Symmetry: C3
Subunit: 114 residues, 3 copies
């Protein structure tokens, strides 16, 4: 799995250990071993949500499987919870795009996962 | 809907009000309320188009519906037009990837749509 | 085709000719003229792979066609090779998401390719 967070909150507002927390929480939520979990946080971005420049985040979670109706609602609660608590971003100013990747379309270490 | 524009144009070249205009123009184009439009501009990027370092842009427009043959042509005319007039980027040095997101695959406000 | 690389490797460690090298190699790999190739490298990123902050890369390759099981396995070798040599990134710390784009969903020059 791969989780990316793009946000206009300042780098200084990102708690030390945030990447580790995301990794551990996602490993638990997806059931995938932490060694296959990648996380990426991009602060200080020039963005607007609903025409407002208040804290917001545009995210994405890619995974080979483990993506679905009920699972995505659960991930959303988990992820919005972490963004609200750690980055002080209101859940209603967060978009998370979920992608169920085909194993043949995910490259890793000189091959794909197919 | 969410629109992201990555470009090598410097930050100082992005005119004041650019995100507001994108928000307003996309709300009109997609027919969605401005409140749900998210815009993200990333300048000063290390990128090339056709092996040239001249002004260029790589963009993406994600939306739950409102994505299609004729609509995408219209969005492209509108967006390349804005990038040319506001950022001085030639339309033929712009790529815009369109994504028709399934509601179940979009997280927001602790849940997902649909 | 469009190739994006997000990495925690410092900007100073990205060779000046890397975008051009990628452009040329990808043109050959995809059988498309170099002018059709766009490349984007984003260094100094805050990321973790497998819970580790050692050099890593999260990438994407979008193309209208030229994407598939065998081709993707080949692209992974080409790209891991370039990232390993030019950016000193271990190949098992590289993820590449491949996207086969419909021509109708790719905007360029005020229109789309459909
Ligand atoms: O690592 C990922 O998710 N799945 C991991 C995984 C777990 C178990 C496997 O046998 C194969 C692959 C990819 C990260 C990049 C985006 C697509 C999913
Ligand atoms: O279309 C979108 O807008 N978000 C919410 C929303 C509000 C109102 C609608 O009628 C539909 C969708 C998503 C934005 C994030 C990327 C997936 C599409």
């Amino acid at each position: 799995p791969m989780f990316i967070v793009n946000t206009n909150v300042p780098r200084a507002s990102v708690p030390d250990g945030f990447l580790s927390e995301l990794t551990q929480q996602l490993a638990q939520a997806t059931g995938k071993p932490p060694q296959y979990i990648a996380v990426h946080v991009v602060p200080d971005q020039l963005m607007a949500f609903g025409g407002s420049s208040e804290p917001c985040a545009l995210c994405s979670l890619h995974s080979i499987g483990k993506i679905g109706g009920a699972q995505n609602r659960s991930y959303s609660k988990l992820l919005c919870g972490l963004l609200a608590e750690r980055l002080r971003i209101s859940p209603d100013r967060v978009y998370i795009n979920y992608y169920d990747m085909n194993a043949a379309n995910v490259g890793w270490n000189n091959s794909t996962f197919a």
